[PDB]
Amino acid sequence: DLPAANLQQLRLPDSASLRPAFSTHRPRILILYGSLRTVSYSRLLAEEARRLLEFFGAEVKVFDPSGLPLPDAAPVSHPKVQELRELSIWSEGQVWVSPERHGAMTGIMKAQIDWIPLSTGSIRPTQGKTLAVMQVSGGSQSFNAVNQMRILGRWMRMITIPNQSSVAKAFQEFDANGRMKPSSYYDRVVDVMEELVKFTLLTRDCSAYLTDRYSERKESA
Amino acid sequence: HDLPAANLQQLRLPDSASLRPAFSTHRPRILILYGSLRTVSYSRLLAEEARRLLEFFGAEVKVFDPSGLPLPDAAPVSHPKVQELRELSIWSEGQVWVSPERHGAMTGIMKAQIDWIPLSTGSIRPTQGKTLAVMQVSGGSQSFNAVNQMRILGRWMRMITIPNQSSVAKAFQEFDANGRMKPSSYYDRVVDVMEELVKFTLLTRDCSAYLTDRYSERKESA
């Protein structure tokens, strides 16, 4: 038996709670990228992600981090901070696309997430929402940035989908018009977006049940 | 906006029907792996509390005893402990991995079990698409080094690693003389993690094949 558990708060999982009526609205995907370079492969990859997601039927919003103050260097009502926070609240899933800069995710990528709180009043800007992580680099393949982002996804309490993208030697993959050529990298991008839409459709309607936790029911009681 | 790099014959729209086939009626199958061979092992004792909770939640639970598991490539694959582990992984729909944190990392014993499990053995994918909960136990103050490592490892195994996780600090203090976890914030988190695992397993097991039906695979198949 279970002498450390409160049997009043323990609940058997309920199949019907996992299957509420399917929503019909476009899955809401926020896309963030980690560069302000004029020629930014992370931005250009974010845009390829957008085109795919839109094809699949998602409503996509891409946040431009230009003009974002450093965390705590402005009030939370700053135009770009409010935009980012409202975008996160609006989202049902997110794509984060970071350059790998000095073998890690970028300060721009992390500063965006730094500005997003786990909670504000009753609202949880990220909890339970789906996440796809992707990186790009001018050098040979690495996973340092996507590893950091996947751990970060846990801290934000997101459902980080298993598939992810790491594009090596990015300048070889994007043409003069900023479009990705057919490649194994591109096929991965398609798989990741494809998976993200499926996970978002699967989880969004029962997310409140999925985050209805024993410990929180216990503290309410 | 156009998609000149895509194979437009294999690119398909999401299908809602496919995310909701009829629910299976058999108990969710959960395999629990733990990362220590010590006689009194807090990871094993935590594994056992996980088992108890998962059973209450209606899962069929199996726990693998790693005692006698050879080092990876130190024995043939047909070694009994290897075959048993592989069979157990195949059988499972979701898993719990419970690792001590030793020298600020997951244990050699934990990693060795996962190293013995291949992504593909013939037509069978022992781990792909299955849910995963990660937990660690430590003799010292809080760290998440082991669970962070196991979470990255979950990606490499193509598992749906649930967001919640448990890290029990100074674990020796949290277990009584009967090997039972004491009531605490840590225990309530173990409840939450097991609760979450069952929900995600129920949610995903029946549409896993659709979730894992990939553009790049169809393209290569055509």
Add this chain to the structure above:
Amino acid sequence: HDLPAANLQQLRLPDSASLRPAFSTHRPRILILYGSLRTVSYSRLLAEEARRLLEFFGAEVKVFDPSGLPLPDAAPVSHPKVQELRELSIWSEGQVWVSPERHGAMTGIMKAQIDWIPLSTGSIRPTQGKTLAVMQVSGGSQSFNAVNQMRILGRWMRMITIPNQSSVAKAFQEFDANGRMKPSSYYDRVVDVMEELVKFTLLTRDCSAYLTDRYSERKESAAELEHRVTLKSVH
């Protein structure tokens, strides 16, 4: 056992004398960077406690204020805060990085500062071979995610990252009303880290060029010379 893949002409037996040139006689030059712009910032307060210790150990210390630093690539490198940062990095012989743990990771402000520092600017290497101590602070229970990330980043900056480090848990509990760190195991550790950083910087600063004199670079330089001469039609 021979070395068929090695260019024997660029191989060098490590030379003990070269690891001991005359000691420098100026104060070890330490740059401190921190990862918060909060009014009450425990990383900044920790940075200042680190400065006092370093100065007691005889270092010359400069602390960079990241306020007004543009986002990487959001301004020309001639931006006054960017020049300041790069100039301080070039000046430094060792560094301390003090990051909060925000969302379980090093902070965007911490990483943005390093993002603004190139491995190379012409012949100048702003970070290579220099010593580094990493430290973190958190509002919550202990973690090492942030110091772990910084330790890897120190490799990528080609720094000699010292084995010891500080992670202060529930940092608000450990600083008093004057912003001074209270006596504790955590403080004793900060002392050990600063003591260690100064020893490594003294040990290493004078022979850095030798430590950083690499086979593959001697091999490349030789190939490049030969190529340049050939392009000018010299037999």
Add this chain to the structure above:
Amino acid sequence: HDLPAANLQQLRLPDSASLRPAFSTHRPRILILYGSLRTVSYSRLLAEEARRLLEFFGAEVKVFDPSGLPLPDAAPVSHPKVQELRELSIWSEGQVWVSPERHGAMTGIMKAQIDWIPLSTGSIRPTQGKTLAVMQVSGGSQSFNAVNQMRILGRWMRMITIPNQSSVAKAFQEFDANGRMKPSSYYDRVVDVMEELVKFTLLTRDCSAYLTDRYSERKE
């Protein structure tokens, strides 16, 4: 000297002379550990290339064979393969760790070997203050996951992990039929890593007791 949290008796100013003791003459003792027991193992062949380089550079090199090593706690600290390993570690002044990347991480074999090495065994510190070079091999395209994990592990072992490291992608392409590594930028990196490890080990081995001498420990 505005240091109120500090016990001013335990504080010493750094001593330049204590960083420069008479140089040792004996050859630098390096232990190599590898993370694969496969018949054809590129971490083992890489480990052997490391050995040849370090010997040329004037190190005395020992390589531990992890075969027959029991799993941790599956045998007493006295298991013969255990006695062998702790001691090779106690003998070494620096170490090379060479792990495959398996499932995007260092191997169980690599981890099990260091799990078996305590921070202390009474008064000896098999690892504290010793130098460390980390290297990985993969069958796939480049990654740093295994060397990243090993670098953090070097911190937990209190070692001086040198900045330079090796990661060899598609390692099967880089070794010929005789098990020798082919000339390449990967090989040139290996040379650099070994060269650096020898320099660091000569630099630090004599003043280690001074370097590992702490305010906190002599306060306690």
